[PDB]
Amino acid sequence: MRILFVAAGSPATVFALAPLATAARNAGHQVVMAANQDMGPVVTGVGLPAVATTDLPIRHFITTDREGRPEAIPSDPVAQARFTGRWFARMAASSLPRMLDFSRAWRPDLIVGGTMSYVAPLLALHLGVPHARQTWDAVDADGIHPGADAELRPELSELGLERLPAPDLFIDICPPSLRPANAAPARMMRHVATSRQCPLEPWMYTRDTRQRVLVTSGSRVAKESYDRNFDFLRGLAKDLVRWDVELIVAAPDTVAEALRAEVPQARVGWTPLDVVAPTCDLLVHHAGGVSTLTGLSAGVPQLLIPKGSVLEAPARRVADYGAAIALLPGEDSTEAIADSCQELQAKDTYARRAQDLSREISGMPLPATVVTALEQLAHHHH
Amino acid sequence: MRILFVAAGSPATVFALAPLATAARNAGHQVVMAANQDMGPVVTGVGLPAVATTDLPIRHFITTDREGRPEAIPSDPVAQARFTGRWFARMAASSLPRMLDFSRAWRPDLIVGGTMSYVAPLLALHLGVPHARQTWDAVDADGIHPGADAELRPELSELGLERLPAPDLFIDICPPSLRPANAAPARMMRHVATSRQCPLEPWMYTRDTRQRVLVTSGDRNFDFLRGLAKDLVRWDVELIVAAPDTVAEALRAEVPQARVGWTPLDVVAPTCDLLVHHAGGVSTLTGLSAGVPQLLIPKGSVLEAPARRVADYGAAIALLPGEDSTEAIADSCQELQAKDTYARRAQDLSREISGMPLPATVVTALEQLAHHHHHH
Q1: Potential cystine with A60: which of A56, A112, B234, B354 (Cβ 3.0-4.6 Å)?
Q2: Minimum Cα–Cα distance from A196: chain B residue
């Protein structure tokens, strides 16, 4: 059958959906993935044909409203969650006329979209094909979807609705231990780490007696759907050198270049998180995209520095579980960061709990087994 | 598990292994694919981490005669097959030191190689781990493997062996109806077509009023394409030529009616009325999986019997060297486009391929192989 996957405007949205999308291709289905135009090479780099939902990048939709006026990001956590739904929704609303034309020409039997890929359910409603939603992280969307529903009032009105409908199939990669009790019934699916790949360098797979700490931006792209920075690194690397930690830095090339000067004691560049993660004793990141779930699947302790209101509660869940330390706004001092790495490095309780969670992820159903669910869904509709 | 896949020196060897390698990745395994350095981009373009077996192009591993002149490919079918096995084995033996250093560092639990990826079983023997072999087409390697054994005899003796052992698991993507009568039992697996990807353009999924013919090849790859393209363009056919960028601009300039460029076969093939594959490289299995009739113009005695096999089945016409006159090419294209039996047989083979076990199911076989090796 013919399946249209819809990611969104940042690389982790592609990476999160790629295991199921390539598993579907591996089962003999015709599969295409739609994403913003600038995600095109990200899509084709996971081995899939790419379609552009829109030629505008996410920065356009984040910073500008449907009326073409600049919009400020609010700080209140309820407001910011709604704002997140709103900007993903105006991207979808903007993409809908082109995606309708494409879908009428390509004739999908089924549409699979990411959590906030709102063009996916809109297309489903217009065209009468089933919609499956796959989550793309462990982030609660209960405060996000209402922001989307409000912003889509014009599109939903035409369809006789006040809110987007429930998915025909909901697939959730969130480990049950981190899954809120109010989440909708889902077909569980194992998160499988993917990214853009490279020629392997011995250090990505060759350990020494050091202690391997990876500070990472999650994707090499300059703009993910969440803030990242990186000022903290200089002071942190000094702390680490006394620990003869082997410090590895994966960052966008411009940031990567500045860091080579600021912390010369480190190995700075870009490397895929899925390749290097398993080899690490600690991951330090901003708790965006698929980074946290990738770290948990590898059994690695993490320092989570969430930047963005919707990213905070999921990061605290992992710390509360015992597999991470999470430094939320106002907690992330120079000293706090150093002390946290010290403790993650030196107390094996974190590694134990990270491994407990890895084992839980590895018991979840494989993407290949969820392809069966997609086939059953379309057979029942069609 | 950690699984090392070993393709070889041409994109087709990478594409053939990619469904299983990505299926293994999708099952949570750490997967790496090794191939010639110049294939690194192909490996990364299917979504896998790449490692280089060698930086030398495969044609540089054919040795020279007594007096230093490069060795002629002999014409006899048996002789060619044996020569091919020796050539691939020489490549394998040359890459064994680099790959052994890698494998000792990475520690694969299982090694999967394509048919003539002989470094794969050698590595497996050195590291004491299982070896699976996957076919990367429908070519019988019965005449090929003895040449490899002869070439590898010194490496085999270091391991206390006189010949390569059977694979610990043999995986065949050949449709049953096309396998030899004598064929070894294999874990059967569906061929799933895989290519380098690009942004989807409307023409790739939109037909017009014309019959659509795709030609791949695969320098008289040039004389042929131009010659053929001229012909097909005269019958008001929509001609799509899949050529390298190295000749794209020259071909366009000659035959401006043909669409010459960026063509992922997995995307476009199902959309065609006819595929024409010249020289070799491409799997006739992708056309079959798409259910499209094919004109096969093999060059290399190793490619003749399998192309003959698809023709005997009735899904293709195979023009062997000397048979591909302009008239024969033209009559064959007309037949493939118009006759019932060709369309029906190609659809029959597509149905057969579609009933074969999925790559994701073969990953399970790899896991069992690894498990039984060290748990008793």
Answers
A1: A56
A2: B47
Q: Would residue B298 count as lying in a domain?
A: yes
Chain A / chain B CB contacts < 8 angstroms: 113
Compare all CA atoms of chain B with the CA of A107 and give the residue at the minimum distance. Answer: B205
Q: Is B240 exposed, middle or buried (0-12, 13-18, 19+ CB in 10 A)?
A: buried
Within 10 Å of residue B334's Cβ, how many Cβ atoms?
A: 12
- Contacts with B289 from chain A: Cβ below 8 Å: 28
Domain of B163: which CATH number? 3.40.50.2000
- The torsion defined by the Cα of B22, B27, B30 and B33, in degrees rounded to 10, comes to -20
Q: Are residues B361 and B247 in the same domain?
A: no
Q: What angle do CA A98, A104, A107 make, to 5 degrees?
A: 125
Residues of A in contact with B360 (CB under 8 A): 23, 26-27, 366, 368, 371
Say if the Cβ atoms of A47 and B51 lie within 8 Å. no
CB A284 within 8 A of CB A216: yes
Q: Which residue of B has its CA nearest to A208?
A: B105
My answer on whether A372 and A357 are in the same domain is no
Q: Are the CB atoms for A17 and A7 separated by under 8 Å?
A: yes
Check A368 against B360: CB less than 8 A apart: yes
SS3 content of chain A, % helix, strand, coil (to 5): 45, 15, 40
> Is A195 contained in some domain?
no
Distance CA A49, CA A31 (A): 8
Same domain, A287 and A332: yes
A380 and A354 fall within a common domain: no
Q: What is the DSSP string of A292-313?
A: HHHHHHTT--EEE---SHHHHH
**Residue B41 shares a structural domain with residue B154:** yes
In terms of domains, do A80 and A219 share one? no
Place of tokens 């993935």: A33
Which residues from chain B sit within 8 angstroms of residue A275, using beta carbons?
49
Query: How is A201-257 classified by DSSP, letter by letter?
Result: -HHHH---SS-EEEEE-SSSSS--SS----TTHHHHHHHHHTTT-EEEEE--HHHHH
B205 touches chain A (CB under 8 A): yes
Task: Output b/e per residue, A277-294; b: 16+ Cβ within 10 A.
Answer: bbbbbbbbbbbbbbbbbb
CB A289 within 8 A of CB A307: no
The conformational region for residue B68 under phi > 0 = left, psi -120 to 50 = alpha, else beta, is left
Task: Nearest chain B residue to A22 by CA: give it.
Answer: B22
- For residue B195, being part of any structural domain is answered with no
| Most A-contacting residue of B26, B51, B100, B208 (CB-CB within 10 A), to test interface | B26
Q: Rg for chain B (alpha carbons), in Å? A: 21
Backbone angles phi, psi at B300, to 5 degrees: 130, 115
The answer on B228 and B142 residing in a single domain is no
Q: Rounded distance, CA B289 to CA B22, Å? A: 19
Of A134, A164, A172, the residue nearest A361 (C-alpha): A172
Nearest CA distance, B243 vs chain A (angstrom): 19
Put simply, the answer to whether A52 touches B105 (Cβ < 8 Å) is no
Write out the residue range of the structural domain in which residue A251 sits.
200-363
Same structural domain, B291 and B320: yes
Contact yes or no for B23/B30 (Cβ under 8 A): no
Resolution value, angstrom units: 1.9
CA distances (Å), B145 to each of A281, B164, B243, in order? 45, 9, 31
Q: Is residue A270 part of a domain?
A: yes
A77-106 and A119-127 are packed helices; what angle lies between their axes, rounded to 10 degrees? 40
Q: Which residues of B touch A196 (CB under 8 A)?
A: 44
Provide the number of structural domains found in chain A: 2
Residue B360 is nearest to which of A23, A32, A43, comparing CB atoms? A23
Phi, psi of A92 (to 5 degrees): -65, -50
